Structure 1
Amino acid sequence: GRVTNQLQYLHKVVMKALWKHQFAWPFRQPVDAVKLGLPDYHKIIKQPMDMGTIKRRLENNYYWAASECMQDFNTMFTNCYIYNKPTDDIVLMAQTLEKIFLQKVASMPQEEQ
């Protein structure tokens, strides 16, 4: 991977805002299905993703383009909607964070460097 203007923005603007959010705590590290008591989590969710993993990938220049990082954010949110019950608080928390994600992505620099 490499350092682009967009990936810097995703790291220093988007992720930083999401990371600090009061609903972000369940998403800052990989889902621990045993510790959280989530039955069949890894049988249902085949590509776990979380903001800690994404943050580390940004720090280690893992991504080649902004879209790749955005796809990882999407996977994290989608996993949450797929696995959990519609009425679970975690779904509402993911929706709230995801709206901020899209809002911030809307103002990301247009051409990648």
Structure 2
Amino acid sequence: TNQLQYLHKVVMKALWKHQFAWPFRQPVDAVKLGLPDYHKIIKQPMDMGTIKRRLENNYYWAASECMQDFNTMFTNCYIYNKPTDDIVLMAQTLEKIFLQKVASMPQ
């Protein structure tokens, strides 16, 4: 769809290259990051590499479905991490760009 193309080539491209994006480009590796409780707390992991791959393999039936994946990724971050962790500020910065770009998506 026009909307899924926009999420791929306008929204995702802006977020992917952002200087705060690196923690979010691939799944949380709880073993390599040493977080034995991550998957006990976060039951729907999500990340931009997964969303990007889904955008390219025609996984999504509708724009809102892809937007929900973006939301899950950010929400996971807020739920798991402490309020003072830098990664929370990074998610918020990226999430605001997401919402800005989504506001200009074809209707």
TM-fit CA distance, 1:39: 3.3
Match of 1:106 among 95, 103, 107: 103
Distance 2:31 2:84 in 1: 21
Q: Distance in 1 between matches of 2:36 and 2:93?
A: 25
Q: C-alpha displacement at 1:34, in angstroms? A: 1.1
How many percent of aligned residue pairs carry the same amino acid?
A: 100
TM superposition shift of 1:38: 2.0
30-39 vs 17-26, which moves further: 30-39
Superposition misfits of 4+ residues, deviation over 4 angstroms: none
| Deviation sequence 1:19-45 (CA, Å, 0-9, x none) | 000000000000001111223000000
TM-score w.r.t. structure 2 length?
0.98
Within a 5 Å distance, the mapping from 1:11-90 to structure 2 comes to 11-90=8-87
List runs of 5+ in structure 2 lacking aligned partners. none
What is the number of residues matched between the two proteins? 107
**C-alpha offsets along residues 33-79 of structure 1, whole Å, 9 cap, x if unaligned?**
11112230000000000000000000000000000000000000000
Provide the C-alpha distance between the structure 2 equivalents of 1:77 and 1:55, rounded to a whole number of angstroms.
15
Deviates further, 31-40 or 72-81: 31-40
Q: Can you give the 5+ residue segments of structure 1 that lack an aligned partner in the other structure?
A: none
